[PDB]
Amino acid sequence: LLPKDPDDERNAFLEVRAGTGGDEAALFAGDLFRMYSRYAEARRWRVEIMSASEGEHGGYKEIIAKISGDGVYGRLKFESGGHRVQRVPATESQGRIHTSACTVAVMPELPDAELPDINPADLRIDTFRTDSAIRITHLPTGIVVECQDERSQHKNKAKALSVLGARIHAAEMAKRQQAEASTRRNLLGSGDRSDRNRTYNFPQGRVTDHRINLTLYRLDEVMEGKLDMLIEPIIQEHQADQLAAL
RNA sequence: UACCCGCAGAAGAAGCACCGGCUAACUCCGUGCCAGCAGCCGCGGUAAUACGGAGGGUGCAAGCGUUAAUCGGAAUUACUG
RNA sequence: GUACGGCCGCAAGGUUAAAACUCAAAUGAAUUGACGGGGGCCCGCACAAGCGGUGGAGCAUGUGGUUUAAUUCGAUGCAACGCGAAGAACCUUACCUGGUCUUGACAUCCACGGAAGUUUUCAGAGAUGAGAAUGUGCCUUCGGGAACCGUGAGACAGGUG
RNA sequence: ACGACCAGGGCUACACACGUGCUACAAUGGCGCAUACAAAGAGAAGCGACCUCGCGAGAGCAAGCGGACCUCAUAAAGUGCGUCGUAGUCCGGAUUGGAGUCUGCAACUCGACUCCAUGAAGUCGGAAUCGCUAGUAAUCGUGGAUCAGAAUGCCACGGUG
RNA sequence: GCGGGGUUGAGCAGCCUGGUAGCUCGUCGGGCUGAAAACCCGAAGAUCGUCGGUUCAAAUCCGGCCCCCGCAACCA
RNA sequence: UUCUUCUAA
Ligand SMILES: [Mg+2]
Structure with missing residues (x-):
């Protein structure tokens, strides 16, 4: 019943890079990519790695993929942003909590x-x-x-x-959406692609969104593709942003 | 005018700061190295006495804090010293 | 000991000498340590002297990786790796795939209804579905209960999370 | 439902990589016959003789012994003779087909073992690296636990040295 | 406009008168280290720019092209 | 003779 974004039914081009913190983030660049591989295979979506780049230390400097199927951009458009990992490095023998993060770009x-x-x-x-x-x-x-x-x-x-x-399309439709003031009422999050959207505390096994502040100690499941546990209540609050402005 | 006289009913009249240490005074809940705090040492990196709320408490009081400002503590320009 | 200015110098530069700023330290001796490609001493299948072996081959066995619906989990310098596990066909099994179940397999409480229990047919992969004969061991001024089944009520259980 | 139950799965997958083993690459050996020699344990439905039958794995009888009694129980390396003659071999045994045996509801995944056929690699192993100072290394058997079944593992035990 | 060359990843040898693909580092994997280096050990990888021809056979010889690289675009 | 380095509660 709601007037939806017509690019939601489009598929997703995907852009993941390494982030700040060193090899941990560069690993965490490769770490997140396995989950979407588990996710799109669970979503019966074809993962097509268009280009890949490691840091040659087990972690991906970056990767470009295309995921295609049914309404793929409509499920992944929220993911574009900063996403933080909190864990302890293997070269550390004291337990000093290093922290790292990564950059996400999702395009129709x-x-x-x-x-x-x-x-x-x-x-x-x-x-x-x-x-x-x-x-x-x-x-x-x-x-x-x-x-x-x-x-x-x-x-x-x-x-x-x-x-x-x-x-x-990613530049212009962001430059169309950031220009439109009243359209951002029907928008979960800030609209910029740089928010620390979700924190991954690994010793707690903790998944913590920040746009709706949804916290899960379900990371082992989520990392193996149990992600519609997260994407769907986002859309439930994204369309709550759409319904309550109507 | 001061001042004096009765008049009504507890009636018409309390707050602000703070409680990790220095520094008198604390628990609980949210909160999670985020949000914040902060004079200093410093807290928050899930169990926060230091964040926010609750209560409770401390301290002043029609004020209470903050900032600015000057000397002091500083024998830290030392005559004393 | 720098900038600017003065001063001097053939020059190199010297000399005089700031501040903006920034930090909550900087330093001094001394102490216990640790450490030393410092010194001395001592010991070690440490070296030397010996013997055999590994790394090459095949297979067993374990881990990583990869894969998987799942390949349960933990252990990963020495001090993980024929470890946990002194023995995974099912079981184990903690994992997957379906099939299921909810005071629950289970503990105890609480009533309630059948003494338990005994034999059987069929459906069902099985977890279970009605049939189907019974008994009165226990006891009682005897709800038929307790033992023992079923039902109900919550207290809670349960968890190799 | 991160709780409870059932079947089936999987924990045993598989380009690889590593650890740890086992067995090899032979003539001090291989094979055949003969023969000598332990120690320590295990055992009641056990160990099960004995004989039977099966090439064997086993099957049947079923003693005996709770065991300094009987069973497991014949140690093997060795010794003696014969043979092989320097080869992928009478080395070596992988793999695979066939055919069984036993266990247990049940051996497709996923067992062990027997028999027949099959006869890979391997002809002492790079840089490197391990163990060991005497009954030790080395080498040879035996047993034990775990265990329905199922160890090159572990734990013991003796032999040679 | 004319000369030059195009080669495992890379940069290059050989390109020899056609029977003939080497190097080095890199890579991969071990070893060494507590770890990384360094070093050591072991590995692998080329249709010789392209379209063709000549040839028994082309990286080779030849022709055309692609790419560059050099050079020359003068005398009033 | 030669002999380097060890992010961040
Ligand atoms: Mg190794």
């Missing part, structure tokens, strides 16, 4: 047909080491998306453009 599946204002004069495309590596740079936004992991040039080009065109 935006086709280039749904991107009419794309312009190759507004693009800068680099081909390097038949050369298979593709670096596409969107000139008015400065958005640079590389793809080199495929064996051929044509496969890397569409993969570097689709994430970039999603980042054009």
Whole structure:
């Protein structure tokens, strides 16, 4: 009955990087990615890693994936933000609590047909080491998306453009939503993609949201993909933001 | 005018600060190195006497705090010293 | 001991000498320690002297990793790794997949209704579903209870969380 | 329901990586026959002779012994002879087919063992690294617990040295 | 416009008159260390830029192209 | 002869 965001039914391009705190966050970049792998397989969604980058110490410097299926952006759009891990390092033999965090970007599946204002004069495309590596740079936004992991040039080009065109959608629809003042009533959270949304205390096994301040000692389950325990009450409060302003 | 006389009924009249230590005075609940606190040492990194609330208590009192400000403590420019 | 200025110098620079700022310390000796690619001493299959073995092979066994609906969990320098576990076909099993159950398997309390209990048929993977003969061991100025089943009420249980 | 019960699963998966073992790469050996020699334990439905039958795994009889009595119980390395003749071998045994045996509701996952066939790798192992100072190392058997069944493990025990 | 070259990941040898893919580090894995380095040990990886031809056979020889790299774009 | 380093209750 509620007027919904029509990009919710789109799928999700996904962008995870390493964060602050050292290898712990870079591990925690790789640690979170297994959960969404468990989640999207539980959600019967196809995980498609478009590009990946470790810190070569067991932790991912970054990773770009696409998760596709049924209403994938409508379940993952809330996740974009800071997410903190609290644990004890293995090189520490005293129990000094180091803390680290990571950065999340969730974008709708935006086709280039749904991107009419794309312009190759507004693009800068680099081909390097038949050369298979593709670096596409969107000139008015400065958005640079590389793809080199495929064996051929044509496969890397569409993969570097689709994430970039999603980042054009990620830039512009954020710049449309932050411009609209009364539309943010139907919005759970701040609307910026930088809030420390959820803290992971591992010795407590604690999952603690911060936008609704929902605390769970269910981390072992959640890390293995029991995440609709969290995503659904977010939407229940997100649509409570939608219903109470109507 | 001061002042004096009766008049009504407990009637018409109490608060602010603080309680980890220094420093008199504490428990409980929320809270979780967040929110905050803070003169100093310092708290909050789930069991907070230090955060917020409750009660309870301390201390002043029609004020109570805060800040600014000057000397003091400082023999910390030392004549004393 | 720096900036600026003065001073001096052939120059190098010297000399005179700040403040903004920032910290809640800085330092001094001395003490117990620890540590030393310091010194001295002593001891150790520590080295030396010896013997065999591992690492190569195959397999057992364990962990990691990976995988899994699940591969239950713990132990991971020495001092985890044929460890927990002196022995996972089921059981174990703590895990998965379904099937189920809720004063609950169980403790005790509390009534209530059948003495228990005895044999059986069928459904069902089984957890269970009605059939189905009974008994009166116990006791009583005898709810038929207690033993022992079932029902109910909550007290609570339970948890290898 | 992080509680209770049932079946089935899984705890045994599998590119790998490591630990720890076991068995090898042979002639001081292999194989065959003959023969010598323990110690310590275990045992009542037990240990189960004895004989029977089965190539054997076993099956049946069923003594005997709660055990300084009987059973387990024949120690093995060895000794003696024969044989193999320096080879992937009469080394070595992986794997796999077949066919059983036993256990236990039940051996698909997922058992142990027998028989037949099969006969990988392996011809002393890089950098490295381990153990051990005498009955020790080395090497050879035996037993025990755990245990329905099921140990190259663990715990003992002797032999040689 | 003309010359040059395009080679395991990388940077490069060999490119030899065509029967012929080496190096080094990197990588991977062990060893060493309490750990990381360093070092040691062991591993693997190339269709020789491209489209073709000549050839018994092309990295090789040849031709065209892609890429650059050099060079030259003069005299009033 | 040679011989470096150890984030953060
Ligand atoms: Mg090792």
